[PDB]
Curated annotation (Swiss-Prot), chain A:
It comes from the Bacteria. GO terms for molecular function: rRNA binding; structural constituent of ribosome. InterPro entries: Ribosomal_uS15, Ribosomal_uS15_bac-type, uS15_NS1_RNA-bd_sf. Transmembrane segments: none annotated. This is Small ribosomal subunit protein uS15. Coiled coil: none annotated. It comes from Thermus thermophilus. NCBIfam families: S15_bact. The gene is rpsO. Belongs to the universal ribosomal protein uS15 family. One of the primary rRNA binding proteins, it binds directly to 16S rRNA where it helps nucleate assembly of the platform of the 30S subunit by binding and bridging several RNA helices of the 16S rRNA. Forms an intersubunit bridge (bridge B4) with the 23S rRNA of the 50S subunit in the ribosome. Gene3D superfamilies: 6.10.250.3130, S15/NS1, RNA-binding.
Swiss-Prot record, chain B:
One of its GO terms (molecular function) is small ribosomal subunit rRNA binding. Part of the 30S ribosomal subunit. Forms a tight heterodimer with protein bS18. This is Small ribosomal subunit protein bS6. Pfam families: Ribosomal_S6. GO terms for biological process: translation. Located on the outer edge of the platform on the body of the 30S subunit. NCBIfam families: S6. GO terms for cellular component: cytoplasm; ribonucleoprotein complex; ribosome. Gene3D superfamilies: 3.30.70.60. Belongs to the bacterial ribosomal protein bS6 family. It comes from Thermus thermophilus.
Length: 88, 101, 119, 73
RNA sequence: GUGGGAGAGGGUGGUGGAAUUCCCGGAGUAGCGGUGAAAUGCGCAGAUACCGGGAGGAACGCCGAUGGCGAAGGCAGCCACCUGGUCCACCCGUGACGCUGAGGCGCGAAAGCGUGGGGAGCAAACCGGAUUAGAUACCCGGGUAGUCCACGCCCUAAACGAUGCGCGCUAGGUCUCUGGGUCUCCUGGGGGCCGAAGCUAACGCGUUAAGCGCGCCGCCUGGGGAGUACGGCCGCAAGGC
RNA sequence: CUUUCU
């Protein structure tokens, strides 16, 4: 699954400042993580719909955060995207 | 790396030589799949609740290994292969939930 | 022609007819009997009485093969199960034991409408 | 009417999770490989839930039965 | 975010015992079966009842609840793997990032459809027996599609709480499932019953509102004609909207 | 057992 390490290693990798857990970026970071994992889980299990909804929801919450970002500081935004790999 | 428990049951008629033969393989098998053996509990022969493979008895084993989740099945998919091996049940380590204590 | 003494008796009861079957310690039948066996066709077949008759019949016949001790095994229900046993117990044979070994699935084959309904 | 005694009482500090402890588990089965109710075992929906799970394991392992023949009748 | 919890939530691989059917060996004989009665049917090519072995399909007794999980449809043997939702504690981080939601997209019991496979039991149609005044039925004996798997359709339902979603507020009592606590009681989430105020035509609802309010969506406008005709869109078709 | 109608 997703190691605490795997997780935290990402949190550190994004925090606005030391000890940043809930900043917008961090969140978007994590989601892209959980999304990508599950994005994979279904690459195989094309039947497992129930899980797929969970996915739809994640994609939601993400676009929503970002939209907010885009709006507030259009800079950080352009940053986070590139920095991640969203918008193919 | 997760801790499991490998219940194993083979033919109770085996002779010390034939019996060791199987064990030899089991140990190997485990090690063939990163089954780091934390401990053993070889109970021996026991009166089965119902016959198995026709035999009214069963010779048990119990290894509390630690190995790669991604290969637990492979491991047993491999253990069941042996013929004198009639039962295999790779449980997962669980904190002892007590009661009336 | 065999002389067994220590045997075994199987009572298969049903809401349609009772039918006992005496057997040797290995499980091989020796003598058998049904409500059918003794007259009684169709309806009368089941009834506890017919069951008594058959019960006895079974023993009486196995009384030749020299039977004496028997372990009774009941299967099913039906007017006549418990009854038959009463018979055997008397008859002449020593009824060392009784055990209900009626078959029951742990839910497998869909029963016919007759016995459906369960949700 | 299950008015005898809770199996749990006539027992000790035992691990409901141990599926090889025949000697103690065998207690929760009736006069058949039938896992007793709570009106007889007397455990929390949670404890009882675990036992049941455990027992079934013993069955596969072959230490505990699935169903015994009913004597008497 | 961190630390915990429960669960038939979903997907994959495997695996356990019970029962039914069939096949094999044994033993054994005159019936079995089925009904209100019966018959059809099966049985001396030896059935039924019994023991042993095998093969196979489908379902998962007890636990089991008056229970749990899911958005719904729905989900219960056991094991591992992959994976969704969700609750609690700590107040630790962001700083209104919120709600609803016409279209869109997805999911959607059963039956049904396409291709391939599988088929033990069950069973529309059908073939017989019986019942009846008649029996195109109810009962009995058979039985094909189907039921099962994969892949692709179909898109319905008493798809029921016949009760759209979210939020704030308005006595309690009692039972219960799951978390936390100073753990004979407190407190958070969930399932029930009784009931304040209030509401309702009544029945009833009543902190799990059908009460008091605000936000957004859907919907109704007497019965029949009619969920029909027509047009359109979707479907392989049945047919749906 | 099925067991209509006014
Ligand atoms: Mg704070
Ligand atoms: Mg600040
Ligand atoms: Mg459907
Ligand atoms: Mg279907
Ligand atoms: Mg088809
Ligand atoms: Mg007919
Ligand atoms: Mg029929
Ligand atoms: Mg049939
Ligand atoms: Mg209450
Ligand atoms: Mg409550
Ligand atoms: Mg009032
Ligand atoms: Mg009320
Ligand atoms: Mg009109
Ligand atoms: Mg067309
Ligand atoms: Mg008339």
């Amino acid at each position: 699954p997703i190691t605490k390490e795997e997780k935290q290693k990402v949190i550190q990798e994004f925090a606005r400042f030391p000890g940043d857990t809930g900043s917008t970026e961090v969140q978007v970071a994590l989601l892209t993580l959980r999304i990508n994992r599950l994005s994979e889980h279904l690459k195989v299990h094309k039947k497992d719909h129930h899980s797929h909804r969970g996915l739809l929801m994640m994609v939601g919450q993400r676009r929503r955060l970002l939209r907010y970002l885009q709006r507030e500081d259009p800079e950080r935004y352009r940053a986070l995207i590139e920095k991640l790999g969203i918008r193919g | 790396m997760r801790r499991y428990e490998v219940n194993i049951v083979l033919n109770p008629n085996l002779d010390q030589s034939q019996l060791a033969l199987e064990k030899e393989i089991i140990q190997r098998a485990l090690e063939n799949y990163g089954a780091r053996v934390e401990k053993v509990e070889e109970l021996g022969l026991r009166r089965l609740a119902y016959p198995i493979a026709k035999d009214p008895q069963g010779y048990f084993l119990w290894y509390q290994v630690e190995m790669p989740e991604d290969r637990v099945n492979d491991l047993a998919r491999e253990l069941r292969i042996r013929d004198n091996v009639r039962r295999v049940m790779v449980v997962k380590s669980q904190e002892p939930f007590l009661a009336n204590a | 022609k065999r002389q067994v003494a220590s045997g075994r008796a199987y009572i298969h009861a049903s809401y349609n007819n009772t039918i006992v079957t005496i057997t040797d310690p290995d499980g091989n039948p020796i003598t058998w009997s049904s409500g059918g066996v003794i007259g009684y066709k169709g309806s009368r077949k089941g009834t506890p009485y017919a069951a008594q008759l058959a019960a006895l019949d079974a023993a009486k016949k196995a009384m030749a093969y020299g039977m004496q001790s028997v372990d009774v095994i009941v299967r099913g229900t039906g007017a006549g199960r418990e009854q038959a046993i009463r018979a055997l117990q008397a008859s002449g044979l020593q009824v060392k034991s009784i055990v209900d070994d009626t078959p029951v699935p742990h839910n497998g084959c869909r029963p016919k409408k007759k016995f459906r309904k369960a949700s | 009417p299950s008015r005898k005694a809770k199996v749990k009482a006539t027992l000790g500090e035992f691990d409901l999770r141990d599926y090889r402890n025949v000697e103690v588990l065998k207690r929760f089965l009736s006069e058949t490989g039938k896992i007793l109710p709570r009106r007889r075992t007397g455990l929390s929906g949670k404890e009882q839930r675990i036992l049941a799970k455990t027992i079934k394991r013993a069955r596969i392992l072959g230490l505990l039965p699935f169903t015994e023949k009913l004597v008497r009748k």
